[PDB]
Amino acid sequence: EVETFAFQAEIAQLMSLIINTFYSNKEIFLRELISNSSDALDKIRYESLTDPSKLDSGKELHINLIPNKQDRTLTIVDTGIGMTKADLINNLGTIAKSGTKAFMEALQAGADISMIGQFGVGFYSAYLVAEKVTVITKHNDDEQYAWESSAGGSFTVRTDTGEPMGRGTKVILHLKEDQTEYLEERRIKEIVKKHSQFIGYPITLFVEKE
Ligand SMILES: NCCNC(=O)[C@H]1O[C@@H](n2cnc3c(N)ncnc32)[C@H](O)[C@@H]1O
Ligand SMILES: [Mg+2]
Ligand SMILES: [Mg+2]
């Protein structure tokens, strides 16, 4: 069973700005998604201090980058706190705790899209390079869910079965046809070293089987 939701208007507007603004420095999407993963890892790390059983779903705190040229996907995986169903809907579908409004105003006042993470909306930079984004997530004490959107003002949520994660989040970027440079090992390595070199968790770049 698939549920379909409308983005909050301001989030739809933000996504359209990201999709339609001419802006060549697209590579910053990866730093923003890695940063979100790092935040999620900080959160489960902290919660596990006072409740060690929260790591029963996996003790290792890390980030995996998985390119697949056959599927034309780049997946950012973490073993962070994950998201409940309500978290998915609120945190990806609405302004929530973010500086969405401040960012859109800033872009009219000299700011540029690379500053998106300063406003807590870095997730949407995925749409610089992806035509569709799928988010698979598992939080302690909720079930596994799949969130999905190709923008256009709506997203879907369904339960996800058959490939259970222990705990965390997978952001699957279905890349635009002209953005396949981000599947190349040397390109990914270059971007991680440039923008994500101080992240306090291991980042493992998977090798392609083909
Ligand atoms: N809708 C405004 C932007 N807010 C978010 O993208 C929020 O979604 C959640 N989020 C994004 N990527 C995540 C991730 N990899 N793990 C856990 N939560 C994540 C965070 O709460 C983040 O602040
Ligand atoms: Mg938020
Ligand atoms: Mg928990």
Tell me the CATH number at 84: 3.30.565.10
Mutational pocket test of ligand 1: of 29, 33, 34, 39, the residue with most ligand atoms within 8 Å of the beta carbon: 39
**Containing domain of residue 117, as a range?**
1-210
Give how far Cα 163 sits from Cα of 51, 101, 178, Å: 26, 37, 30
- Pairwise CA distance, residues 67 & 185, whole Å: 8
CA distance between the termini of the chain: 34
- HEC string of 172-203 equals EEEECHHHHHHHCHHHHHHHHHHHCCCCCCCE
**Cβ proximity of 175 and 73 under 8 Å:** yes
Measured CA to CA, the distance from residue 161 to residue 146 in angstroms comes to 9
Structure-solving method: X-ray
The CB-side HSE value for 124 (13 A sphere, CA atoms) comes to 33
Task: Give residues (CB < 6 A) around ligand 1.
Answer: 11, 36-37, 40, 78, 80-81, 83, 91-92, 96, 98, 120-121, 123, 169
How far from 203 is each of 43, 117, 162, CA to CA, in Å?
A: 17, 19, 26
Q: Are strands 3-6 and 154-159 parallel, antiparallel or unpaired?
A: antiparallel
Give the Å distance between the CA of 97 and the centre of ligand 2: 4
CA 123 centroid distance within chain = 5
Q: What is the number of domains present in the chain? A: 1
Task: Looking at the CA of residue 90, tell me the nearest atom of ligand 1.
Answer: 1
How many Cα atoms sit within 13 Å of 165 on the Cβ side?
27
DSSP 49: H
For residue 193, the tally of other CB atoms under 10 A from its CB is 9
The tokens for 158 are 């369904």
Q: With left for phi above 0 and alpha for psi between -120 and 50, is residue 203 left, alpha or beta? A: beta
The resolution in Å comes to 1.5
